[PDB]
Amino acid sequence: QSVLTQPPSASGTPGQRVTISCSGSSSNIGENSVTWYQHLSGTAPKLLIYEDNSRASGVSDRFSASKSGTSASLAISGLQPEDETDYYCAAWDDSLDVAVFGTGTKVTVLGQPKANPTVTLFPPSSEELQANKATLVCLISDFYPGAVTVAWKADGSPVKAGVETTKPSKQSNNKYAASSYLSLTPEQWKSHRSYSCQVTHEGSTVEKTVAPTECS
Amino acid sequence: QSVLTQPPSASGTPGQRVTISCSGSSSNIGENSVTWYQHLSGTAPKLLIYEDNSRASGVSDRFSASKSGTSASLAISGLQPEDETDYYCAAWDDSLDVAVFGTGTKVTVLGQPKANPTVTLFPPSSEELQANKATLVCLISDFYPGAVTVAWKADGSPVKAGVETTKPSKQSNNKYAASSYLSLTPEQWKSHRSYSCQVTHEGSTVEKTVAPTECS
């Protein structure tokens, strides 16, 4: 669907001042009031910032928001461990006239050298194609902090549906690891010219492409 | 949070029928339309119904809604195991002059069936080897419950060194997915006859095998 864009991750060293930005449009962010939440897995969308600029209750003087055009930003001014959570922004869309959401940002209290993903994409193998099935995999490893955004395109038009993306987990090296896969029909696969995976990580945006090649 | 009053939980079993309630005031539910969202801990809410009764694109017929008077009801007919998430109502508020959000309701699918994992083993891509590098991926998807035990074997013995295994995460269908990889020299790769990935899901075990190359 069409959402409000936010980086996968934002972060810095303790005490440091970080800020999660969030971009929308003409019809939402820049016409309505951005609301900001703190989420984390285990029922808790705790509202943080209402009416753009205003702080909820039990809301640390540490947080404050803004709003330029079609953009808004939440800056946590004094990074504490208690901050590493998911942050979400939301605005009303008078065009769709439904509440439009941010894709979330994870703030990590950066305890180690930032590292970018090593994106390795794989096409379906033969004894899989031989089995009438074709699955692609975007191994994503050696990265920190542990939050990435993955998109898949099939001929340049991006595939939304069928993509499954693991949740990063600290490897043996302390660095993170994730995989995202797409399940196709051997026809569905040999019915495109190229298949690309696209991981974005704090600033870096790698991307791999693939295309069918074997006794076709 | 707390504003558009929803039952805090609802329980079912695959195939029942559940109805999430949604209670307002005249200035919101009474007067504007109700919108419903589905939330998957760590995703970003996806629109489920709009204009009180209409389905966003790609929403099952299992879902229907109604604005009773000042309250609205979302109903899951033939309840499924991927229906297990949080649900939210929303409405514009005439006086407050803002969008009011529901307190949330989380469904539970009482006893999902056991599902044994799909193992897909993958050999180094030509193009990963085209740069002297070989990684092996055992993808292990659509399994339930979530615990697995992966094991590598290079020529029937436990090539257990250079292997990272993800911690299982719950996908879009409330069925897990995990994936493990083996990283070896393009030599070390070709240095074997068979490389097998082994998965023990609940006393069961499927082992998949891969041999260095073939097919023109």
DSSP secondary structure letters along A91-106 = EEETTTTEEEEB--EE
Shortest CA distance from A130: residue in chain B? B215
For residue B44, the chain A residues in CB contact (below 8 A) are: 3, 88, 101-104
Token reading at A72: 């808004």
- Residue A201 CB partners (closer than 8 Å, separation 6+): A8, A9, A116, A117, A143, A147, A148
Length of chain A: 216
Q: Are strands B35-39 and B17-23 parallel, antiparallel or unpaired?
A: unpaired
Contact A80, A14 (CB under 8 A): yes
Contact B34, B6 (CB under 8 A): no
Give the DSSP letter of residue B175: -
Contact A48, A115 (CB under 8 A): no
Contact B37, B46 (CB under 8 A): yes
Residue whose pair of structure tokens reads 């993903």 in the numeric block: A117
Contact A169, A176 (CB under 8 A): yes
Name which of B120, B123, B171 is nearest A135 (Cβ-Cβ).
B120
Helix (H) or strand (E) holding B129: helix B126-129
For residue A45, the chain B residues in CB contact (below 8 A) are: 1, 39, 104
- Short-list A173, A170, A172, A154, CA closest to A162: A154
Rounded to the nearest angstrom, the minimum Cα separation between A215 and chain B is: 5
Token reading at A124: 């379906």
Token reading at B125: 């891509």
Inter-chain CB proximity B177 and A178 less than 8 Å: no
Which one-letter amino acid corresponds to residue A50?
Answer: Y
SS3 assignment, position B50: strand
Phi-psi region of A161 (alpha: psi -120 to 50; beta: other; left: phi over 0): left
Residue whose pair of structure tokens reads 């029937």 in the numeric block: B156
Q: Cis link prior to B124 (omega < 30° from 0)?
A: no
- Short-list B41, B45, B135, CA closest to A101: B45
User: How many CB atoms lie under 10 A from the CB of residue B74?
Assistant: 26
Where do runs of H (alpha helix) occur along A95-211?
Answer: 126-129, 186-189
Query: What does this entry list as its resolution, in Å?
Result: 2.3
Name the segment(s) of chain B with CATH classification 2.60.40.10.
Answer: 2-111, 112-212
* Residue A31 CA: distances (Å) to CA of A82, B78, B83, B118: 32, 40, 34, 47
> In angstroms, rounded to a whole number, what is the distance separating the alpha carbons of residues B214 and A138?
23
Contact B154, B212 (CB under 8 A): no
Contact B92, B26 (CB under 8 A): no
- Short-list B82, B206, B61, B215, CA closest to A214: B215
Residue whose pair of structure tokens reads 């879009």 in the numeric block: B172
Q: Within an 8 Å CB–CB cutoff, is residue A98 touching chain B?
A: yes
SS3 assignment, position A154: strand
Opening angle at CA A207, ends A204 and A211, nearest 5: 175
- Short-list B150, B151, B140, CA closest to B117: B140
DSSP secondary structure letters along A40-98 = -SSS--EEEEETTTEE-SS--TTEEEEE-SSEEEEEEET--GGG-SEEEEEEEETTTTE
Inter-chain CB proximity B169 and A171 less than 8 Å: no
> In angstroms, rounded to a whole number, what is the distance separating the alpha carbons of residues A101 and A106?
15
> In angstroms, rounded to a whole number, what is the distance separating the alpha carbons of residues B102 and B37?
10
Contact A134, A185 (CB under 8 A): yes
> In angstroms, rounded to a whole number, what is the distance separating the alpha carbons of residues B61 and B44?
22
Contact A140, A117 (CB under 8 A): yes
**C-alpha gyration radius of chain A:** 20
A197, with CB counted inside 10 A (0-12, 13-18, 19+), is: buried
Contact B209, B195 (CB under 8 A): yes
Architecture of the CATH domain A112-212: Sandwich (2.60)
> In angstroms, rounded to a whole number, what is the distance separating the alpha carbons of residues A3 and A88?
11
Opening angle at CA A101, ends A99 and A104, nearest 5: 160
Fold of A2-111: Immunoglobulin-like (2.60.40)
For residue A123, the chain B residues in CB contact (below 8 A) are: 125
User: How many CB atoms lie under 10 A from the CB of residue A113?
Assistant: 7
Q: Within an 8 Å CB–CB cutoff, is residue A144 touching chain B?
A: no
Helix (H) or strand (E) holding B190: helix B186-190
Give the DSSP letter of residue B56: P
The neighbouring-strand residues paired with A77 are A17
Phi/psi at A46 (nearest 5 deg)?
-85, 115
- Short-list A125, A210, A185, CA closest to B121: A125
Q: Cis link prior to A145 (omega < 30° from 0)?
A: yes
Residues ending a continuous segment of chain A before a break (C–N > 2.5 Å): none
Token reading at B60: 């099952």
User: How many CB atoms lie under 10 A from the CB of residue A130?
Assistant: 11
Q: Within an 8 Å CB–CB cutoff, is residue A57 touching chain B?
A: no
